[PDB]
Write a protein that binds this ligand. Structure first.
Ligand SMILES: CC(=O)N[C@@H]1[C@@H](O)[C@H](O[C@@H]2O[C@H](CO[C@H]3O[C@H](CO)[C@@H](O)[C@H](O)[C@@H]3O[C@@H]3O[C@H](CO)[C@@H](O)[C@H](O)[C@H]3NC(C)=O)[C@@H](O)[C@H](O[C@H]3O[C@H](CO)[C@@H](O)[C@H](O)[C@@H]3O[C@@H]3O[C@H](CO)[C@@H](O[C@@H]4O[C@H](CO)[C@H](O)[C@H](O)[C@H]4O)[C@H](O)[C@H]3NC(C)=O)[C@@H]2O)[C@@H](CO)O[C@@H]1O
Ligand SMILES: OC[C@H]1O[C@H](O[C@@H]2[C@H](O)[C@@H](O)O[C@H](CO)[C@H]2O)[C@@H](O)[C@@H](O)[C@@H]1O
Ligand SMILES: *[C@@H]1O[C@H](CO)[C@@H](O)[C@H](O)[C@H]1NC(C)=O
Ligand SMILES: [Ca+2]
Ligand SMILES: [Ca+2]
Ligand SMILES: [Mn+2]
Ligand SMILES: [Mn+2]
Lengths: 240, 240
């Protein structure tokens, strides 16, 4: 289970409970979601994701209960260029989820090209930190960097303008209150700059009772490192 | 991960994070470690165990840290016989642990006959609630029902007299403080009757850095049900 929590203050190399997909790997006590060359620089055309191995019981039909959850994490993006792409996302999906074919670049390794904007064809909730919005390839993005809440589509149901800071860690807190059904996102840089965005969502109609949680990131022709530095998570089934 | 925690107030039939071994299965929101017929009656010659799927980081060689953990659980034993057997145990072992060949009866599904008392051929720490002590078969046991702390051997490093109460739930709290290296056990029946037993053990010299936790139970010629009713576990790495 009714409750589950875990915390990674750092990411040592001897991991046992993480499912690594794509190019994701541990380097310097942090998770490098996207590939990097020998000297630690970001490269183009790369996708990577990680999921915690234990499944989370998001909701239970028999007891009519729904879980609340809180995911706290920090990441940093770095790039030689100034148009780093494509972004990192915290997501929740069915337990057997895998990188969809052709989900690189602006699809963040979460959606397939042909069904990226088809809500009845996906089962995923993600909080994206999108740094690339060129209208030729990312036709669905607002015209500026942003934090978005994605519900079964790459076209966010709600966004807030965000600023990308090269090499600076962003502290994020994602919370889902089953009582109000609000998914709240609070992100802050160390100097106090704060960004907030929320949306009301009934998780029971979007995801199965048991899911897995993790992160995804990608770089198409434009690139940047997507470094996940720490992550804590907790969920508890509740009667509302 | 550095910290992991989970709680099972009850055990619904739909489980995803438990590894079932032997005859263990879910029945009536509880785990029946040993096999029962269609009427829910215990039968002879049965062994079963469960383990949480996520591995627990018990200690870390590189940082000189050892986990502080707590396992709270409750179980009940029932049998029409005057000498129900054989007992249930909470245990900690390497991740790939499986039921040893020929470990039934008094071996509780934790040790192989040929090496049951060879502390050098085993890697396990368990807290047993032993109800069968026939001196002609369980030669290693004291002559009475008991709670025991097992360290790489079926011959407990320590035991205390315990009363078996048919059909009554026993609540148990097992904790380990890495500072004092004390493994404490406190068990209580609903009327306030209490049993305590403690032992100093350096887990680092007994178990690998990553382990799995769970329960094991068995019945030889004599039988009884071994029902795990609830279980919550928490673990956190600390400096020592
Ligand atoms: C290798 C070797 O040398 N072996 C034997 C010893 O085993 C033997 O001792 C006897 O062993 C019996 C079998 O042991 C198995 O079961 C027990 C209990 O579950 C386990 O603890 C053992 O580890 C072992 O378990 C596993 O069994 C499976 C399957 O059989 C096997 O595959 C596994 O390999 C095995 N595991 C291992 C590690 O070996 C044991 O049952 C005997 O215990 C009885 O007898 C002693 C005295 O001799 C007594 O103190 C006990 O309480 C028990 O008493 C009997 O209890 C039953 C149940 O109540 C009675 O039957 C009931 O009686 C009432 C009347 O009152 C009615 O009639 C009911 O209908 C009826 O059910 C029965 O009457 C009791 N019998 C007696 C004599 O009192 C014992 O320890 C020794 C000596 O025989 O020889 C070898 O060393
Ligand atoms: O990684 C950024 C982006 O790269 C790819 O699209 C390209 C960009 O829009 C830009 O470089 O212009 C190119 C030419 O029009 C275009 O290919 C894709 O991989 C895209 O998904 C990704 O977001
Ligand atoms: C103890 O177990 C080890 C490893 O299995 C074995 O090599 C050794 O012979 C055993 N010692 C005794 C005294 O049985
Ligand atoms: Ca984009
Ligand atoms: Ca015994
Ligand atoms: Mn976007
Ligand atoms: Mn014993």
């Amino acid at each position: 289970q009714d409750s589950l929590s875990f915390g990674f203050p750092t990411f040592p190399s001897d991991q046992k409970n993480l499912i690594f997909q794509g190019d994701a790997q541990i380097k310097n006590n942090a998770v490098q979601l996207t590939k990097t060359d020998s000297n630690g620089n970001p490269v183009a055309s790369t996708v990577g994701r990680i999921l915690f191995s234990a499944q989370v019981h998001l909701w239970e039909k028999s007891s009519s209960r729904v879980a609340n959850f809180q995911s706290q994490f920090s990441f940093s993006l770095k790039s030689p260029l100034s148009n780093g792409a494509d972004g990192i996302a915290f997501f929740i999906a069915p337990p057997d989820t895998t990188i969809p074919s052709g989900s690189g670049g602006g699809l963040l390794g979460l959606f397939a090209p042909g069904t990226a904007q088809n809500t009845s064809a996906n089962q995923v909730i993600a909080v994206e930190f999108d740094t690339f919005y060129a209208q030729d390839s990312n036709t669905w993005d607002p015209n500026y960097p942003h934090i978005g809440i994605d519900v079964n589509s790459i076209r966010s149901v709600k966004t807030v303008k965000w600023d990308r800071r090269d090499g600076q860690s962003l502290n994020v807190l994602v919370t889902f209150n089953p009582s109000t059904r609000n998914l709240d996102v609070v992100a802050t840089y160390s100097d106090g700059t704060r960004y907030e965005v929320s949306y009301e969502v009934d998780v029971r109609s979007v995801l199965p009772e048991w899911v897995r949680v993790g992160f995804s990131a990608a770089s198409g022709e434009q690139y940047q490192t997507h470094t996940l530095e720490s992550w804590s998570f907790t969920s508890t089934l509740l009667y509302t």
